[PDB]
Design a protein around this nucleic acid. Structure first.
Ligand SMILES: Nc1ncnc2c1ncn2[C@@H]1O[C@H](CSCC[C@H](N)C(=O)O)[C@@H](O)[C@H]1O
Ligand SMILES: Nc1ncnc2c1ncn2[C@@H]1O[C@H](CSCC[C@H](N)C(=O)O)[C@@H](O)[C@H]1O
Lengths: 193, 291, 291, 193
DNA sequence: GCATGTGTTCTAATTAGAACGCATG
DNA sequence: GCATGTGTTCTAATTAGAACGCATG
């Protein structure tokens, strides 16, 4: 994905699933404030969404997937969110000739197990990156991110101890975590502020 | 909606079979008369592979557990003209009370077929023919059948093996094969009654037998669990060669790997009804070389 | 010797087989092209009878346990042109340290063959052809071999299956068959080496295997008891279809009665080397109808 | 077997196996001279006797088979005596044409078990007759007889139970009985006295 | 109206495997 | 000059069968 000059960066057309990030994208300056009504589409139950639904919803510049945050709100099996995300992601890919940059990202709030994680990486064709989001005096937030956003896989995040992160999930029993991984998208689209 | 192909332009078929079991697909294709250019089988049961290799003398390339097949593998082994597979139903069939569904346990292996199917799909702008088929049990949660159809973007046709075999076997068939909804018609060499499948000096109590599972209990018919065969005026269960004939497999197809009775029924229990698969693959003769 | 018989005067052969086992006699006779008019088999093993009837579709008249065959039975069922049999060797072979000779245990059953033979013999003044043959192991006490020859008034011919089979089987053969002492010669289709008997993708470690008994341990060769087969780079024991090919039986000849491996080896371990019996019955097709 | 005129009854030619019956037979007048090579031929061990032997030993009018008297006196299995007796017996029967009467008998001194008994009757083609010698004050001596002698299986004997016979054998641990058994014989051959 | 089913499981039968055996080329 | 054998036995692994389960035509 070559860089796009500032004067050709259109606003993002984001498809958000399982979780709404309209507040995050508006904060970082990717989403207009005046109602498009929507430059960002959000769906929560995708069991009955078909390809022609996603196609009808207009081309999407980014497809966001996210597991539910830690808690008992896990209504469905964990893997359901990934298989469904992968299913709709293929619907959203434009024609092979890529007219513009197409980005996707799927975030897990430390919910998938390793058995689930390997299926995730196999289907997303990428090993996940962990966000420490832990200050010296605070280690609260931590999530896993599969994404083709170049910056999200390029630089070095803070390495973590897998046993420690598993221990943080058992002890549990947002911007720095994911929004810090959202900033690199500004380079490719319009910045509103 | 498949473009007719003149015979000279036809080339042998390249098949990717996932969860190949005992290589039913290859058996059907070869019995139809189609030239099998390549048959890549993904199977993890040793005895299953033993049958496929021995019964077909090494024409099947076994790869392995389907979850280790990569996009690169699909591109090297390809292109594929036919992708066929039936995911394990032990966690989907209603016969198991403790089944875990399509998203946990073994049901999730379906998505591997879905995943590799898209890898195998011809890229945009490749008008060349490409067929696929997915099979599984009818006794499945509506939500699972729904989601399966969702991922495959196709609705299944149910075909019960009783129309062409001597057994109850109702199975859904997702796919794009030419004329899957056509009326299922019997052949002159189809063994439609249990008596046609038995050995010499064996009497069939029933005209049709119930759905055959991996366990020997599905041979005991009805609620009274009566034996289906009388021999020399004595009750007896079906024989392995008889189970094979019921399914349409060649007799002695599973006399392999020193397998006993339980093993051979276990492989036949999850197999396909050969005549059913023959009814589904029949229109492929008009798209690939034959000899 | 007997006088040659003009072809037209030849009639089908009427065979009385005692201890028929898996009907090896009938098998070789039919494979030789000889018309079998009547085959009266005395056998008590359920599975043995199952193989005979199923594999030959009821042409064998199974009478029962030999000790209940009466004089009247021999004349009703007769006349007989061929009387053949091999008594159980569990109390005669040297492999059993607790054998009881041929005067106690199961060795007595020899004299039943001697008894029913003299009943079947044509009375004086009947110069019609009549042939008989008796088989048993070589590893018997010299006193037993002596007495057996005494009762049959004939000395045995030892023939080792190794010349025509891929296995060691040395056996004594009493009888009056034409040319039993002739040198045995191999045929085109005789599987002489273990590799010729194995399935696809299996490698033979040896040219010949040691004498096959009822027990699976006789499949492991030599003093080390190593596995005779390699496949997929792993050592393995022989398969039932391979055991059958070793003995010269048709493949899947013992795929009957849901029999497992121990059962099929039990039946094959006590049987005859088909090619050896073919060598013995070969000159019979000059005395009986052929079709 | 019809009766023979007294003046054409030639001296008997007998073959005795496992037991010498010269004393019992001569006592009833069947051998003419102190030396009678033709009258009786005796063999104790037959393991090497062939048909050519019996054929050349001169035609025989009677073939006697007997088991060892009850005692730990025989190394051979009881069935051996019957199988061998039956073997030679077929050697001794003359041609199918019947020139003269041919008789045979086989006695067991309570030595054969029930298994050997059924094999015996099967091979000798008849159920045995029991010869008891009891005067009330004694019921000790008895034997079983298979024979084609018409009078040996026509007269009525002192029918006694099997358990009673088993008891007699356990208690034991011929002149009167075997002679009564043999008397019908001298109605067919020369009476020497 | 009630029998049906590409199975798991727990237990009771049941099988496989090795120890045993020694006269003889 | 040791290896071999138409098998029995006794045990340690296995295998077979029945209880379990219930939404659904
Ligand atoms: N992870 C995996 N990878 C590849 N094959 C698998 C697998 N898990 C199970 N299988 C195999 O998939 C098969 C599904 S049963 C279907 C068998 C086949 N349709 C036939 O006609 O016989 C089973 O034989 C099982 O051994
Ligand atoms: N009392 C009896 N009457 C008839 N057959 C008997 C018997 N006792 C044992 N048998 C049978 O005799 C056979 C001897 S083993 C010989 C089998 C045969 N020669 C073959 O080629 O297979 C055994 O199968 C056994 O089942």
């Amino acid at each position: 994905f070559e860089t796009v000059p500032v004067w050709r960066r259109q606003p993002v057309r984001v498809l958000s699933l399982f979780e709404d990030i309209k507040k995050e994208l508006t904060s970082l300056g990717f989403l207009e404030s005046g109602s498009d009504p929507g430059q960002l589409k959000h769906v929560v139950d995708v069991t009955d969404t078909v390809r022609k639904d996603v196609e009808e919803w207009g081309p999407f510049d980014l497809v966001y997937g996210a597991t539910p945050p830690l808690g008992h709100t896990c209504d469905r099996p964990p893997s359901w969110y990934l298989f469904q995300f992968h299913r709709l992601l293929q619907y959203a890919r434009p024609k092979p000739g890529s007219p513009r940059p197409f980005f996707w990202m799927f975030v897990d709030n430390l919910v998938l197990n390793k058995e689930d994680l390997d299926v995730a990486s196999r289907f997303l064709e990428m090993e996940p990156v962990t966000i420490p989001d832990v200050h010296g005096g605070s280690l609260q937030n931590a999530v896993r991110v599969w994404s083709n956003i170049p910056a999200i896989r390029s630089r070095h995040w803070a390495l973590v101890s897998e046993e420690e992160l598993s221990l943080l999930a058992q002890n549990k029993q947002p911007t720095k975590l994911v929004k810090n991984c959202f900033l690199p998208l500004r380079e490719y689209f319009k910045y509103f502020s | 909606l498949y473009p007719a192909i003149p015979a000279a332009r036809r080339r042998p078929i390249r098949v990717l079979s996932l969860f190949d079991g005992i290589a039913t697909g290859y058996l059907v294709l070869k019995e139809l008369g189609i030239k099998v250019g390549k048959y890549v089988a993904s199977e993890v049961c040793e005895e299953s592979i033993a049958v496929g290799t021995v019964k077909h003398e090494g024409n099947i390339k076994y790869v392995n557990d389907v979850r280790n097949i990569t996009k690169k593998n699909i591109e090297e082994w390809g292109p594929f003209d036919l992708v066929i597979g039936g995911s394990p139903c032990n966690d989907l069939s209603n016969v198991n009370p403790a089944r875990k569904g399509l998203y946990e346990g073994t049901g999730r292996l379906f998505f591997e077929f879905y995943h590799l199917l898209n890898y195998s799909r011809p890229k945009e702008g490749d008008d060349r023919p490409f067929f696929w088929m997915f099979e599984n049990v009818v006794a499945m949660k509506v939500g699972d059948k729904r989601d399966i159809s969702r991922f495959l973007e196709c609705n299944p046709v149910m075909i019960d093996a009783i129309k062409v075999s001597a057994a109850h076997r109702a199975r859904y068939f997702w796919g794009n094969l030419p004329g899957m909804n056509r009326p299922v018609i019997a052949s002159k060499n189809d063994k439609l009654e249990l008596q046609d499948c038995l050995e010499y000096n064996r009497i069939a109590k029933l005209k049709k037998v119930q759905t055959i599972t991996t366990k020997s209990a599905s041979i005991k018919q009805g609620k009274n669990q009566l034996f289906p065969v009388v021999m020399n005026g004595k009750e007896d269960v079906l024989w392995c060669t008889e189970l094979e004939r019921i399914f349409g497999f060649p007799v002695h197809y599973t006399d392999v790997s020193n397998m006993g009775r339980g093993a051979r029924q276990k492989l036949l229990g999850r197999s396909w009804s050969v005549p059913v698969i023959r009814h589904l693959f029949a229109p492929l003769k008009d798209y690939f070389a034959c000899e």
